[PDB]
């Protein structure tokens, strides 16, 4: 995936009008948009088609997939049918759940991102201790795309080590959760940014600002 | 929560027509339906309102919520606005992510179910070794409703031990994944059943048969 400006917009606004406006305003800067459940549960899967029609930006469905293999397969099918380029899947439910998603993505020609360690404080309780093994599981399964935390650069460094230079790594937690764009991009290929852009008075200026830095 | 016949239907059919037809066939037996992302992503969140209108069943949103606190809060907000009575939330992302869901549920008069240990084989890799501690975290947070695996009755037993007899416990993995209805109801208050009913030739007979076995 060639992410324009190394910057992925996390569009977690929950009404259609505002989400469309803000994404439109930053389209000169960003060609890849991460759409998750706050927007999808508010406006429907039809929102993915709408973004493709309006903007011709790649769409990553941030659905943190975390069910049994049979249900993960259905979720991936529904999400790729709607037009997502990629889906984010949790590794902590284990290898069979991840494989189920890889099998659908292989079949429909789309991508899986493996979420390895999360960026919020609570991630320290259980996920962090499992994360290096989760990332190594991903590599053994042939996963090529990963997600790891902007808020813990030492952990993001370790996860880049495990997955190698050829793997693709994107990282949330920049801005509102306290991660730095520059320090993150020493390990991640691209940064994910939501609130620092979408809650700005001038989203385009906020995006331009991050990019210029 | 009083689940009729201790049986919750997991409605994971992916089209509106089949989902409404199958649910209508078993409505005599079941007043609680677990609706997950397979149905919601195929048909929209309006399907929740439509089930309440047609059936008046309780709806548990099986969304395995597993994001950062701020995002979990927005998912719970959207879900309860859509008319879900309860939502399923993962414990593995930690206490702050579960507390975000509890906060919204409290504000809206809804219930959070904490998914401790999952029922599929992959659960053994990472989740199982954290599951007792996740359950203890639930107790510490004041969680009253939990989910644990029919496929590992000794783990389900341990979950019931940790949370005590006054917490409510529901359990998937019955039928298709190899769990036994009667054995699971030694420890769980209610069982979740999907494919054994909704893939049956006569779903009504499948549900009646299950209820008879218990
Ligand atoms: N993907 C993902 C996910 C995993 C993680 O560990 N940390 C996150 O912040 N996220 C998501 O990234 C986005 C971060 O947005 P923000 O820049 O903090 O506003 C949100 O959509 C959040 O749900
Ligand atoms: N809730 C939940 C979930 C957590 C888990 O550990 N195991 C499950 O099977 N489930 C869900 O319960 C249902 C079990 O359905 P079935 O009876 O195996 O067809 C599915 O909706 C599955 O996604």
Swiss-Prot record, chain A:
Residues annotated as catalytic: 64
Protein's pathway: Pyrimidine metabolism; UMP biosynthesis via de novo pathway; UMP from orotate: step 2/2
Q: Which GO terms describe its cellular component?
A: cytosol
Q: What is any one GO biological process for this UniProt entry?
A: 'de novo' UMP biosynthetic process
Catalytic activity of the protein? orotidine 5'-phosphate + H(+) = UMP + CO2
Keyword Ligase included in the entry's annotation: no
The entry's keywords = Decarboxylase, Lyase, Pyrimidine biosynthesis
Class of enzymatic activity (EC top level): lyase
Q: What EC number(s) has UniProt assigned to this enzyme?
A: 4.1.1.23
Which Pfam families does the entry link to?
A: OMPdecase
Q: Name one GO molecular function term.
A: orotidine-5'-phosphate decarboxylase activity
What does this protein's UniProt record list under function? Catalyzes the decarboxylation of orotidine 5'-monophosphate (OMP) to uridine 5'-monophosphate (UMP).
Q: How does it assemble?
A: Homodimer.
Q: Which NCBIfam families match?
A: PRK13813.1 (NF010386), pyrF (TIGR01740)
Name of the molecule in the record: Orotidine 5'-phosphate decarboxylase
- Origin species: Methanothermobacter thermautotrophicus (strain ATCC 29096 / DSM 1053 / JCM 10044 / NBRC 100330 / Delta H) (Methanobacterium thermoautotrophicum)
Gene that specifies this protein = pyrF
């Amino acid at each position: 995936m060639d992410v324009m400006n190394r910057l992925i917009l996390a569009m977690d606004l929950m009404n259609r009008d505002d989400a469309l406006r803000v994404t439109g305003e930053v389209r000169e800067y960003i060609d890849t948009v991460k759409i998750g459940y706050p927007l999808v549960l508010s406006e429907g899967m039809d929102i993915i088609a709408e973004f493709r029609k309006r903007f011709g930006c790649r769409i990553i469905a941030a659905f943190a997939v975390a069910d049994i293999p049979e249900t993960n397969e259905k979720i991936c099918r529904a999400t790729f049918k709607a037009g997502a380029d990629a889906i984010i899947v949790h590794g902590f439910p284990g290898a069979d759940s991840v494989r189920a998603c890889l099998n659908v993505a292989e079949e429909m020609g789309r991508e899986v991102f493996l979420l390895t360690e999360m960026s919020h404080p609570g991630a320290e309780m259980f996920i962090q201790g499992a994360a290096d093994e989760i990332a190594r599981m991903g590599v053994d399964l042939g996963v090529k795309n990963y997600v790891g935390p902007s808020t813990r650069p030492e952990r993001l460094s370790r996860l880049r080590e495990i997955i190698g230079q050829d793997s693709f790594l994107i990282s949330p937690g920049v801005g509102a959760q306290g991660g730095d764009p520059g320090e993150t991009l020493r390990f991640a290929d691209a940064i994910i940014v939501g609130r620092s852009i979408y809650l700005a008075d001038n989203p385009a200026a906020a995006a331009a600002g991050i990019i210029e830095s």
